[PDB]
Amino acid sequence: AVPSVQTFGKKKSATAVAHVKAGKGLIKVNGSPITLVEPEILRFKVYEPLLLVGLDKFSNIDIRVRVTGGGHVSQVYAIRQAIAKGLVAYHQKYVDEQSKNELKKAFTSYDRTLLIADSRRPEPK
Amino acid sequence: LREKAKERNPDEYYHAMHSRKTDAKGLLISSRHGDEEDESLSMDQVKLLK
């Protein structure tokens, strides 16, 4: 019944599903808040989808992320990818396309690996 | 079964994948009640049964 949006963030074998919907503004990773995501030195790697665009985008929506697999740093990279492209997809579908591609421009100017992973490797020289 | 999983062809639409659904781990939810009944029953049905 609610406007909701589901995205995916992947690094090596971690995978994070982020559901974004309209709400009061709560960002929850694995049930716990976002301010508990260990190893606590990469908590700003998790935070930078919020601090790159401002918390006034997150003031009206609530995100929840479920992260399985991987290790510590692969899980924080999956979390930040899921949060970033979930915010982009929510502003695409339920807010205007101008804020959509402003968010895409800001995340892509920081690093496009917030939005597109580096996936299939190696190179056979 | 492993060969069928290798040859799934992911552009596979059926009409029954509207009703049938999938849990969090990806497996198949099979409702253990009925499929001619309903699991949740209405408020006036609960009134009569109670």
Partner: protein, 282 residues
């Protein structure tokens, strides 16, 4: 190209099943071909079917390398990756160096954290043809697996009497010219299959005076591999030994790439059967 290669292998094994299914018509069409050739009477089964003869009007104009290697045999040079098992010892890295010097058009790939499914996918979309995976036992290399990549066969061998060019002496540098090949008594159809596998990873058409040679000599299912350089004297031909020597024994040959082990086995070594040690290329 995932879907193209899957459906191409599907169509190939459909055509192969259809060939072995309708291969009786080939030989009975051969029977009525030689019955026209020498005017001898035709059997009852080939005499009363009217549809086969009125197909034979159409089919009278019908008439080595095999189905995986046949499309690009001498047309295109191979491309080989040589990789070790995982976290290899230094003598296996020296042996993989020696095998990549054995095969021309071979490079070597560092192995660690490479899953074999996405390794095979990276090879068979980067365009390589063969993969040689080498396995060791405390330095001593014990196996090599050759996988031909456009859904071709894998031949798995064990290696037995391994003496290495790094192990002997500073005898100099190798030659790396396109060698000549020698295959001694590969007589059965499995022998020709193993010959085609082992020799479509060398370049087609060496020089006639190419001064290095490499021999795969079968001695009771133990292919001795030596490599020699030569210079033809006034009285004979003088052979010097260069590069590694071993004996490989085929224990498996299946019909897919390295990743699955759901591929159909063409041959594998029945070890514990009652008549095991009585025949060769068993």
């Amino acid at each position: 190209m995932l879907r193209r290669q899957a459906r191409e292998r599907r169509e190939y094994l459909y055509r192969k099943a259809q060939e072995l299914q309708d291969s009786q018509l080939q030989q009975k069409r051969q029977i009525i071909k030689q019955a026209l050739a020498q005017g001898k009477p035709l059997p009852k089964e080939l005499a009363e079917d009217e549809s086969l003869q009125k197909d034979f009007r159409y089919d009278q104009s019908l008439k080595q390398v095999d189905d995986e290697y046949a499309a690009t045999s001498g047309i295109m040079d191979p491309r080989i990756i040589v990789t070790t098992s995982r976290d290899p010892s230094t003598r296996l890295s020296q042996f993989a160096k020696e095998i990549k010097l054995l095969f021309p058009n071979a490079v070597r790939l560092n192995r660690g954290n490479y899953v074999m499914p996405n390794l095979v996918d990276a090879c068979k979309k980067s365009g390589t043809t063969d993969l040689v995976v080498l396995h060791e036992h405390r330095g001593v290399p014990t196996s090599l697996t050759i996988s031909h990549f456009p859904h071709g066969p894998t031949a798995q061998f064990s290696l037995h009497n391994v003496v290495m060019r790094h192990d002997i002496i500073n005898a100099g540098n190798q030659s790396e010219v396109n060698p000549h090949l020698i295959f001694d008594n590969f007589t059965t159809a499995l022998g020709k299959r193993v010959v085609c596998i082992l020799k479509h990873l060398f370049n087609a058409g060496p020089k006639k005076d190419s001064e290095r040679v490499i021999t795969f000599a079968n001695r009771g299912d133990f292919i001795s591999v030596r490599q020699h350089v030569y210079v033809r004297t006034r009285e004979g031909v003088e052979i010097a030994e260069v590069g590694p020597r071993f004996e490989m024994r085929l224990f498996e040959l299946r019909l897919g790439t390295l990743e699955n082990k759901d591929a159909d086995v063409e041959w594998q070594l029945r070890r514990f059967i009652r008549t095991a040690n009585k025949k060769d290329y068993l």
